[PDB]
Amino acid sequence: KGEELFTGVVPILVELDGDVNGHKFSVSGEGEGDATYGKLTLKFISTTGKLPVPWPTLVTTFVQCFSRYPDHMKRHDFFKSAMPEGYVQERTIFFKDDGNYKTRAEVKFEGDTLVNRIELKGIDFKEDGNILGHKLEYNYNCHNVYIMADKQKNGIKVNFKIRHNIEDGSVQLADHYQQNTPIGDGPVLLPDNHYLKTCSALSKDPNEKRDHMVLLERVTAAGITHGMDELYK
């Protein structure tokens, strides 16, 4: 079905307008995905100047439909099943001992292009916190994304904890509460419990002047039966 839509490489467009503790900013991303290898390549650029928050804090915000689901786990892939029409992705991200982001996004095909348009509001951040104070290392760890069906909503409930290395020394945890629901009136794949093993590499474009981020990410569905295909482990 929608599965077919991901047979190969898909171009992606990402749009984000945000406001954190009153700071207004805008980001635009482009790149492509290949669910066959569970691989994404993306570049984002702030259009509103220097980013008021660390790039890393937005990674998760900025298309799980690109995950790699093993053949045997295909009945579990809500994301792809959800579309041509797309899904709405809503989240509440709690930065431990700090503020929080609430986000609402729509992911769907617009032509040949897989698009992710986002609205983000962040509040209660500490002016000299790890976030506003930009105390995060420019890096990213691997994380297990837990997935569950949400029968009642005809979608899924997703939960995970991101671990942000603090330049000072420890880790800044960010707890993610996530919900996905189909935009269309079609039937979707409500899966059995599972998870995606995810890893992201953050870099920069030497020949790029605006504040930006280059993201290389890989996602492999897991939790039901072991695969050698598994990213980590």
Swiss-Prot record:
Keywords: Chromophore, Luminescence, Photoprotein. Changing residue 198 to Y: Gives rise to yellow-emission variants. In EYFP; leads to yellow fluorescence, folds faster and more efficiently at 37 degrees Celsius and has superior solubility and brightness. Changing residue 162 to T: In P11; increases fluorescence at 475 nm excitation and at warmer temperatures such as 37 degrees Celsius. In Esmerald; leads to brighter fluorescence. In VisGreen; leads to brighter fluorescence. Changing residue 150 to V: In EBFP2.0; shifts the excitation and emission spectra to shorter wavelengths and increases quantum yields compared to BFP. Green fluorescent protein has been engineered to produce a vast number of variously colored mutants, fusion proteins, and biosensors. Further generation of mutants led to more stable proteins (at 37 degrees Celsius for example) with brighter fluorescence and longer fluorescence lifetimes. Pfam families: GFP. Changing residue 201 to K: Abolishes the tendency to dimerize and leads to monomeric fluorescent proteins. SUPFAM superfamilies: GFP-like. GO terms for biological process: bioluminescence; generation of precursor metabolites and energy. Changing residue 62 to L: In EGFP; increases fluorescence at warmer temperatures such as 37 degrees Celsius. In EBFP; gives rise to variants with blue fluorescence. Changing residue 148 to T: Increases fluorescence at warmer temperatures such as 37 degrees Celsius. Contains a chromophore consisting of modified amino acid residues. Maturation of the chromophore requires nothing other than molecular oxygen. Transmembrane segments: none annotated. Photocytes. Changing residue 44 to L: In mut3.3; shifts fluorescence lifetime from 3.03 to 1.88 ns. In R10-3; matures to the red-emitting state with excitation and emission maxima at 555 and 585 nm, respectively. Signal peptide: none annotated. Changing residue 198 to I: Suppresses the 475 nm excitation peak, leaving only the shorter wavelength peak at 399 nm. In H9; increases fluorescence at 395 nm excitation. Monomer. Belongs to the GFP family. This is Green fluorescent protein. It comes from Aequorea victoria (Water jellyfish). The gene is GFP.
